[PDB]
């Protein structure tokens, strides 16, 4: 059952081309992420503003924390992109 | 694929009546419907209904064919699986080994 308001924030979330972008990179750098220093680097952006545009994509469920001890790295959340797939396909 | 399309199509769906809509249709392949028949399903009046199509149709996301009284719709299904393959693009540096079926 997924909420079509959850759904709905989730492709919001990506309809922008910076957040598009940062997206698009942690799905090609899974299964390890990146820190968000990185990901600021591969966007030419400051690595502040990625910050906000990643909690952006957390809130909406598509980017998720792995954290080892205090070590942070974004990625995608692939069950949560798989399930956007089959919503919008099947 | 153009980026700027890409987030287009983004923009048409992240519209509650929109994907309320689209998912309709891509139930209703390959037939489609006419779009008296997609508002009066979801009990809207035709005006907005047809309004939202015309936007998915901006975006490709829907075909449209001329049958009198209203206009058939269908879903661009290889539209929308192109939208997902980019999404999914270059998963896992290009490999694509990660659970993705
Ligand atoms: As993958
Ligand atoms: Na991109
Ligand atoms: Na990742
Ligand atoms: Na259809």
Redesign the interface.
């Known amino acids: 059952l997924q909420d ?2 959850q ?2 924030a989730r ?2 979330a ?4 910076v957040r ?1 972008e940062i ?2 990179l942690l ?5 390890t992420g990146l820190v968000s220093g990185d990901i600021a680097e591969h966007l030419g952006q400051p690595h502040n503003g990625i910050s906000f545009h990643l909690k952006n994509l957390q809130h909406a469920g598509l980017v998720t924390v792995q954290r080892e001890g205090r070590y942070q790295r974004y990625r995608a959340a ?1 069950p949560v ?2 399930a ?2 089959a ?4």
């Open positions: 079509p308001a759904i709905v492709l919001e990506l309809a922008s081309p598009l997206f698009r799905v090609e750098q899974e299964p692939m992109v798989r956007l797939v919503y919008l396909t099947e």
